[PDB]
């Protein structure tokens, strides 16, 4: 797989901002606050959130699109793992993952 270029990085930033602007992105903007989920960091092995992704994109952490997609997928899979399926959080992960898959298809 090819490395990310500076042009690819403009696309990553675009996709990240589209997610951050979505009405269902509210649970994911910042790292989970342990005061909202006291055992979260003992249960979730690899926490992730959109702010952490934004720091990584700004620092050109990702070498390949697969690593960016893996981090995004952690956001959604962690939320569905920690929360019950009837929670507003679980719903937000399902809607925002579908939106991310629509945007990702753009990269080809």
């Amino acid at each position: 797989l090819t490395p990310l270029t500076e042009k690819d990085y403009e696309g990553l930033k675009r996709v990240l901002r589209s997610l951050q602007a979505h009405k269902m992105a509210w649970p994911f903007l910042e790292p989970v606050d342990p005061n909202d989920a006291p055992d979260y960091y003992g249960v979730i092995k690899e926490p992730m959130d959109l702010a952490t992704m934004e720091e990584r994109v700004q620092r050109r952490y990702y070498e390949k699109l697969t690593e960016f997609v893996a981090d995004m997928t952690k956001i959604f899979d962690n939320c569905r793992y920690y929360n019950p399926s009837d929670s507003p959080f679980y719903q937000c992960a399902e809607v925002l993952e579908s939106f991310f898959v629509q945007k990702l298809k753009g990269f080809k």
Binding site: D36, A37, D39, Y82, N83, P84, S87, P88
Partner: peptide, 6 residues
């Protein structure tokens, strides 16, 4: 594990 309400 139940998260705090928004």
């Amino acid at each position: 594990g139940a998260k705090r309400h928004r």
